[PDB]
Amino acid sequence: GETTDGVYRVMTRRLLGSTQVGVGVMQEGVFHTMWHVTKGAALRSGEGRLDPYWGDVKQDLVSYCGPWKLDAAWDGLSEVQLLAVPPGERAKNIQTLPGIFKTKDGDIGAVALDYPAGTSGSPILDKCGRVIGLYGNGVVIKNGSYVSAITQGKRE
Amino acid sequence: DMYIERAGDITWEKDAEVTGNSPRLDVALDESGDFSLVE
Numbered sequence: 001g002e003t004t005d006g007v008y009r010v011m012t013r014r015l016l017g018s019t020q021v022g023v024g025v026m027q028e029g030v031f032h033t034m035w036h037v038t039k040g041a042a043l044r045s046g047e048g049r050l051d052p053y054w055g056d057v058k059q060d061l062v063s064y065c066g067p068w069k070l071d072a073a074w075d076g077l078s079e080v081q082l083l084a085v086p087p088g089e090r091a092k093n094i095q096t097l098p099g100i101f102k103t104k105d106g107d108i109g110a111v112a113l114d115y116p117a118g119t120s121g122s123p124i125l126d127k128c129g130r131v132i133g134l135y136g137n138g139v140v141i142k143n144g145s146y147v148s149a150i151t152q153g154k155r156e
Numbered sequence: 157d158m159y160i161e162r163a164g165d166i167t168w169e170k171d172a173e174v175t176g177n178s179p180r181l182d183v184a185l186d187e188s189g190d191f192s193l194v195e
């Protein structure tokens with residue numbers, strides 16, 4: 001299978017035609033996506049198989065072939081880029097200044113951008129090109145707009 | 157049966173389109189990983 005670092009679409013042929021259910025990141029030989037995209041199922045990459053290695057429904061994250069590798073964090077001040085990979089459309093960078101989700105357990109950056117559901121797992125990056133989290137788990141606010149948390153895992 | 161297909165490199169793009177607001181929201185996260193607004 002393809003092991004090159006980068007951003008990938010996650011597809012299924014179970015539904016009508018070939019459908020994009022999400023997106024993920026290949027880094028240091030590990031595939032990273034949101035739990036709600038794969039539900040922890042195994043994945044195919046060419047003739048090769050990727051097995052789940054770690055996952056957590058509450059964090060809404062999953063890693064394949066090895067432990068979660070992404071550990072960069074939003075600095076709380078600068079603009080970031082969402083590298084959106086929408087279904088049937090070219091990967092495109094969108095620059096934005098994150099908002100904040102305030103929780104009883106601390107504050108998390110959040111990006112106020114809306115895409116088709118199959119865009120979940122797209123990476124959010126800092127100015128060094130480091131992945132500071134994945135897009136796709138969020139909330140619908142008062143005026144009807146969508147805001148995604150910048151969801152990041154822990155690198156053991 | 158899910159499969160993956162490469163879509164690009166992960167890099168910052170100079171002069172990308174700049175958009176989106178920066179809301180500050182009080183939220184709650186439940187055991188199923190769902191976020192909700194706290195009012």
Ligand SMILES: O=C1CCN(c2ccccn2)CC1
Binds near residue numbers: 121146
């Ligand atoms: O990746 C995505 C999943 C979440 N989604 C939503 C969810 C509710 C309302 C509007 N957009 C944005 C796209």
